[PDB]
Write a protein that binds this ligand. Structure first.
Ligand SMILES: CC(=O)N[C@@H]1[C@@H](O[C@@H]2O[C@H](CO)[C@H](O)[C@H](O)[C@H]2O)[C@H](O)[C@@H](CO)O[C@H]1O
Ligand SMILES: [Ca+2]
Ligand SMILES: [Ca+2]
Length: 582
C-alpha cells in the first residue's frame, strides 16, 4: 500500500508526502486522509520530530490480517522518537458519550486526545513519544514528595472537578462492532495532564473503551444492542512507558455493555459465553512500565482471559490524597490500586513487579499492589511487590470470587499484606513468600473474610518474636491455614494443624529482604536469573525447613501447578514459599 512521510524539521505540506525525499511537515495532512488508510498503508514520522499543538485522529477504517495500517518512525533512531504533543488544543477535542449509564461516574463530555483510534482495526502504532501537556500543571513523579502545604515544592495542579479530560492514546469502539487487532508497541506516553478524578472518561495515558452507538431507548434498540456489540479483540499493548499522567495509567475494556454483563451479579461467577459476547477477548498487556499515574497503574475491565505479564508499575496514586483530590463531589473515587482486574473472567497476572503505590497515609482508601476486585477467577502468580502503602493484595467485597494468589513475593508492603474486606468465597493463597516489617502485619485491620492459606512462608522481619493476629472476622468462613511456615513468630494460626515453625529466617532463605526496593531506572523488569538476578535472597538455603515440606496443593480454581517465582519447575512435594530449592 501507500507509505506517507512526515518531517517536522525537513518537510513541506505542499509536497506529495509519499516519498522520503519529499515528506509532509504536519499531521493535519495525515488527519485529512486517515479515514482512507487501508491495508499495507503506513504513516512514518521522522525521528527527531516534534509536532507541537498537533494530534493524530484515525476513524472508521482498517488494515487486514495480511497487511495492517502502520503508524511509526523513520530516519535515524538516535535522533529520538518523534513527538506528538497535542497540548490539549481545541482540534484534539472530541465528544465522548457512552450512551448508557456506566455507574456513578462521568460518562459523557469533551475529551482531548493526542492519538485517537476510533473503530480502527488491524493497526500497529509504534515508536512514538506522545504527550498531552498543560503548561500550568506540573508535578513530576521523579521528584514527588508529600509536602505539609499544597504545591510548595515548585509544583502546580488543577484540582477542578470539571477539568477537561485528556488521553495520550484512546482506543474507542462505538459502532456496535468489534474493533480488533490493535497493537501499541514501544510508545512513550507522558505528561498527559488530564482530570484528577474521572475514572471512566478517556482520561489517562492509554484508555480503551466501548460505547453504545445509540441510546437504548426502546424495545427495538434493545434487541439490536443485545446483538451488535462495540468491543475489543486482539488488543496488544507492549514495550511501552506511561509516566506522569492523570488519571489512569493504562485501562482497557470499560463498556456500555456492562448493562448486559452486569445485569445479574448472582454469586459473582461470570458466564463464559456472556463475557466473550459482551466483553473484550485476547487482550495482552506485556512489558510496560507505568510510573506516576495520578490514579491506578494498569486495569483490565470486562475482559475475557486477558494476559497481563512482565509489567512494572511504580509510584502510582500520586494524586489520590487529601491535598490533591479536593473536589471528589458525588462521584468519590479517592481510591486506587496498582495492577488489577474489574469484572474479568480468569485474567492472568504473571511476572509483574509493583512498587510504592502511594498515599494510603494521606487519603488513598486503597493503595495495594494487587486487587482481585469484583470478577471471577483472577490468577495472580509469580509477581513481586515492594513498599506499597496499603497491602500486597486486596480481594474486594461480595463479587470478588475464585481468586488464586500463588508463587508471589511481597516485601516491605505496609499496613498488612493481605486485605480481605467482605470478599466472596473461593480464594486460595498458596506458596507465597511474604516479608513483613514493623510497619506491617499479615492481615489488614479491616480484613474479615475468606481465604485459604497453604504452603506460604510468613516472615516476621522485626526484632522480637511477634504475637501475630492471624484471624479477623468470619465472613464466608474467614481465614483458614494449613501447612504454612511461620518464621520468627511467638504464635501461629489455631487452624493450622500442619505448621512448620522456624526461629531464624537466615537458616530458611539466603537473603530475606534483599529484593529490589525500586523499579529499574529503565522501567524494565529485574532479571530473575544470571549475574543480575535480583531475587536470589528468596532461594532456600541448604537444609532449609522449606525444602520438600509443602503439601500437594489442590487449586480451588483448577489452575494446575507449573513453576515457581523464578520459573523453575515444581515437582514432587513442593518446597514451601515462592522459590524451589535448587
Ligand atoms: C467493589 C469496589 O468498590 N471496588 C473498588 C474499585 O472501584 C470500582 O472500580 C470500577 C473500575 O471499573 C468502577 O469504577 C466501579 O464503579 C468501582 O466501584 C476501585 O477502583 C478499587 C481500587 O481503588 O478499589 C475497590 O475497592
Ligand atoms: Ca504539564
Ligand atoms: Ca504535591
Amino acid at each position: 500500500g501507500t507509505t506517507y512521510y512526515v518531517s517536522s524539521a525537513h518537510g513541506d505540506d505542499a509536497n506529495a508526502g509519499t516519498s522520503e525525499n519529499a515528506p509532509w511537515k504536519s499531521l493535519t495532512k495525515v488527519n485529512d486522509i486517515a479515514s482512507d488508510l487501508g491495508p499495507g498503508d503506513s504513516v512514518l514520522l521522522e525521528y527527531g520530530s516534534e509536532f507541537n499543538d498537533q494530534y493524530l485522529h484515525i476513524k472508521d477504517t482498517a488494515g487486514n490480517a495480511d497487511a495492517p495500517i502502520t503508524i511509526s518512525a523513520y530516519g535515524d533512531a538516535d535522533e529520538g522518537k518523534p513527538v506528538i504533543a497535542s497540548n490539549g488544543v481545541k482540534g484534539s477535542q472530541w465528544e465522548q458519550d457512552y450512551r448508557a449509564n456506566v455507574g456513578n461516574h462521568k460518562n459523557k463530555g469533551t475529551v482531548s486526545t493526542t492519538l485517537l483510534l476510533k473503530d480502527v482495526s488491524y493497526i500497529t502504532v509504534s515508536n512514538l513519544e506522545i504527550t498531552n501537556d498543560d503548561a500550568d500543571v506540573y508535578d513530576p513523579i521523579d521528584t514527588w514528595k508529600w509536602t505539609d502545604t499544597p504545591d510548595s515544592d515548585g509544583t502546580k495542579l488543577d484540582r477542578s472537578a470539571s477539568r477537561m479530560d485528556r488521553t495520550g492514546v484512546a482506543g474507542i469502539a462505538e459502532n456496535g462492532a468489534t474493533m480488533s487487532n490493535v497493537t501499541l508497541d514501544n510508545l512513550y506516553i507522558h505528561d498527559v495532564d488530564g482530570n484528577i478524578y474521572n475514572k471512566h472518561m478517556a482520561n489517562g495515558g492509554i484508555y480503551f473503551m466501548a460505547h453504545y452507538p445509540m441510546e437504548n431507548t426502546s424495545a427495538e434498540t434493545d434487541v439490536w444492542l443485545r446483538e451488535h456489540v462495540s468491543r475489543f479483540d486482539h488488543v496488544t499493548i507492549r514495550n511501552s512507558t506511561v509516566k506522569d499522567v492523570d488519571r489512569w495509567g493504562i485501562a482497557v475494556g470499560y463498556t456500555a455493555y456492562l448493562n448486559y454483563i452486569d445485569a445479574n451479579y448472582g454469586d459473582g461467577s461470570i458466564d463464559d459465553a456472556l463475557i466473550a459476547k459482551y466483553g473484550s477477548t485476547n487482550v495482552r498487556i506485556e512489558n510496560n512500565y507505568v510510573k506516576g499515574a495520578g490514579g491506578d497503574a494498569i486495569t483490565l475491565m470486562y475482559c475475557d482471559r486477558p494476559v497481563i505479564e512482565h509489567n512494572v508499575g511504580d509510584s502510582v496514586s500520586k494524586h489520590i490524597n487529601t491535598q490533591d483530590y479536593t473536589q471528589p463531589g458525588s462521584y468519590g473515587g479517592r481510591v486506587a490500586a496498582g495492577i488489577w482486574p474489574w469484572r474479568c473472567k480468569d485474567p492472568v497476572f504473571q511476572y509483574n513487579e509493583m512498587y510504592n503505590n502511594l498515599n494510603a497515609e494521606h487519603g488513598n482508601g486503597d493503595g495495594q499492589a494487587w486487587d482481585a476486585d469484583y470478577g471471577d477467577g483472577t490468577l495472580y502468580q509469580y509477581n513481586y511487590s515492594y513498599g506499597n502503602s496499603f497491602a500486597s493484595l486486596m480481594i474486594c467485597n461480595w463479587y470478588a470470587v475464585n481468586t488464586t494468589f500463588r508463587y508471589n513475593i511481597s516485601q516491605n508492603d505496609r499496613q498488612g499484606v493481605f486485605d480481605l474486606p467482605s470478599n466472596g468465597p473461593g480464594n486460595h493463597i498458596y506458596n507465597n513468600t511474604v516479608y513483613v516489617d514493623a510497619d506491617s502485619q499479615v492481615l489488614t485491620k479491616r480484613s474479615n473474610s475468606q481465604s485459604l492459606f497453604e504452603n506460604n512462608i510468613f516472615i516476621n522481619a522485626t526484632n522480637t518474636k511477634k504475637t501475630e493476629t492471624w484471624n479477623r472476622g468470619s465472613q464466608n468462613g474467614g481465614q483458614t491455614y494449613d501447612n504454612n511456615m511461620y518464621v520468627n513468630y511467638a504464635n501461629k494460626p489455631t487452624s493450622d494443624a500442619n505448621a512448620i515453625e522456624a526461629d531464624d529466617v537466615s537458616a530458611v532463605l539466603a537473603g530475606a529482604g534483599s529484593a529490589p526496593t525500586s523499579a529499574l531506572k529503565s522501567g524494565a523488569e529485574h532479571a530473575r536469573t544470571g549475574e543480575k538476578a535480583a531475587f536470589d535472597g528468596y532461594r532456600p538455603v541448604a537444609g532449609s525447613k522449606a525444602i520438600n515440606a509443602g503439601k500437594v496443593v489442590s487449586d480451588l480454581n483448577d489452575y494446575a501447578v507449573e513453576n515457581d517465582f523464578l520459573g523453575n519447575a515444581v515437582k514432587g512435594r513442593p518446597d514451601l514459599g515462592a522459590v524451589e530449592a535448587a
